[PDB]
């Protein structure tokens, strides 16, 4: 069957640059003097939103910054200029050949001035304990670039027996990322030690950002 | 301003039929579609029923799929038989008009999980702790996805990070952070709200110091 190949899978652009995205059909998507190739933007928690329809008509309600072209088998999307709003995945979609398919998508990252994360660390609540259970949470908020590191010191010694981590997609307004290290043990395996630490080994400072508390 | 909205159970058992509904508000004109996004983010086109009653289904599903409409409840329907875990996805309904020949308008999508595990409501914990204070809510022990997290029933919306969930022990945990004026908390109360569709459960937890 027909495959739509999008390239690149991800791509980083500065605030004001031009972004350029590629869609290639393995066989034509043309008919009656038209191209049934369509483009969408998708932010998380949101459905796809139409940008370009029929290859190069800009959808109503959509900023003239968006445009695309191509024909037959070779299609492209260009955003110009880029805004922070555009941190998102982008799909092409063909609806003139059985089976209808989407490209596997391209994710756009926006480049920005580096930023230190704001770290906060959190005791197991006195509810999680009352029911029997004990989680330590570390928030690593609003930092750039996306690369970060988090280690968990248990009285000055590294722990990997219950760490759970999670990154957010890029913020649409400030272009930062945020992260979330969680640590789960029982009411006891937690009362067996005292010193708890999460280590923010990010770029923006040459040494870690330590945050800590004691049970 | 046509609006579309998917509804149906968010949990289905292997080998059963998944049934979803799409209600249309704001207008026998065009093509009414179903589409899904896999947990790893790829989208697949499922099918339509046109204004004429005619259907078109992706041949990779044509044996298990059925899309119907009732033009006088202004509603249309997906039925997918003999489901397995590979059928887990956010389901969308969307319309195609001849104005564009494209999927112009889309529902918010609804999440469906094929699984034989039991619906488990979440436990929600306060994450109590400058110019700014960062608080939190831990949401532990629920199944299936999704959970929605707001703050002061929506009214307090900026400075919020709601983290993607994660699966352990057959169950999901997710955290959410909020940053406010140091001066007006604890002075002026902060409450995470938590809705778990599949158990139909709402928890508001107050974050006391």
């Amino acid at each position: 069957n027909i495959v739509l190949t999008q390239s690149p899978v991800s791509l980083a652009v500065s605030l004001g640059q031009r972004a350029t995205i590629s869609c290639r059909a393995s066989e034509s998507v043309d008919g009656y003097g038209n191209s049934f190739l369509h483009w969408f933007q998708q932010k998380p928690g949101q459905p796809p939103k139409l940008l370009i329809y029929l290859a190069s008509n800009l959808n109503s309600g959509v900023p003239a910054r968006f445009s695309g072209s191509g024909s037959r088998t070779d299609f492209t999307l260009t955003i110009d200029p880029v805004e922070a709003d555009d941190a998102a995945t982008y799909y092409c979609q063909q609806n003139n050949v059985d089976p209808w398919t989407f490209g596997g998508g391209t994710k756009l990252e926006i480049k920005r001035a580096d930023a230190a994360p704001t770290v906060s660390i959190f005791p197991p609540s006195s509810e999680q304990l009352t029911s029997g259970g004990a989680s330590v949470v570390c928030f690593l908020n609003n930092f750039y670039p996306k690369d970060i590191n988090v280690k968990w010191k248990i009285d000055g010694s590294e722990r990997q027996n219950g760490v759970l981590n999670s990154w957010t997609d890029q913020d649409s307004k400030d272009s930062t990322y945020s992260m979330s290290s969680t640590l789960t043990l029982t009411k006891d395996e937690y009362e067996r030690h005292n010193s708890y630490t999460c280590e923010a080994t990010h770029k923006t400072s040459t040494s870690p950002i330590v945050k800590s508390f004691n049970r | 301003e046509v609006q579309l909205q998917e509804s149906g159970p968010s949990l289905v058992k292997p080998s059963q039929t998944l049934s979803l509904t799409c209600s249309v508000t704001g207008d026998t004109s065009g093509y009414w579609n179903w589409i899904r996004k896999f947990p790893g983010n790829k989208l697949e086109y499922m099918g339509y029923i046109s204004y004429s009653g005619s259907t078109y289904y992706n041949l990779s599903l044509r044996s298990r799929i059925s899309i119907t409409r009732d033009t006088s409840k202004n509603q249309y329907y997906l039925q997918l038989n003999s489901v397995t875990t590979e059928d887990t996805a956010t389901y969308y309904c969307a319309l195609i008009t001849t104005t564009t020949y494209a999927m112009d308008y889309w529902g918010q999508g609804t999440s469906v999980t094929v699984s034989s595990a039991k619906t488990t409501p979440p436990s929600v914990y306060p994450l109590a702790p400058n110019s700014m204070v960062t608080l939190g809510c831990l949401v532990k022990g629920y199944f299936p996805e999704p959970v929605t997290v707001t703050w002061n029933s929506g009214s307090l919306s900026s400075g919020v990070h709601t983290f993607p969930a994660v699966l352990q022990s057959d169950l999901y945990t997710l955290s959410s952070s909020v940053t406010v004026p140091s001066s007006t908390w604890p002075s002026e109360t902060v409450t995470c709200n938590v809705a778990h569709p599949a158990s139909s459960t709402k928890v508001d937890k107050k974050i006391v110091p």
Partner: peptide
């Protein structure tokens, strides 16, 4: 245009 089995025709 009208669509049969996923192709637009007249």
């Amino acid at each position: 245009l009208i669509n049969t089995n996923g192709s637009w025709h007249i």
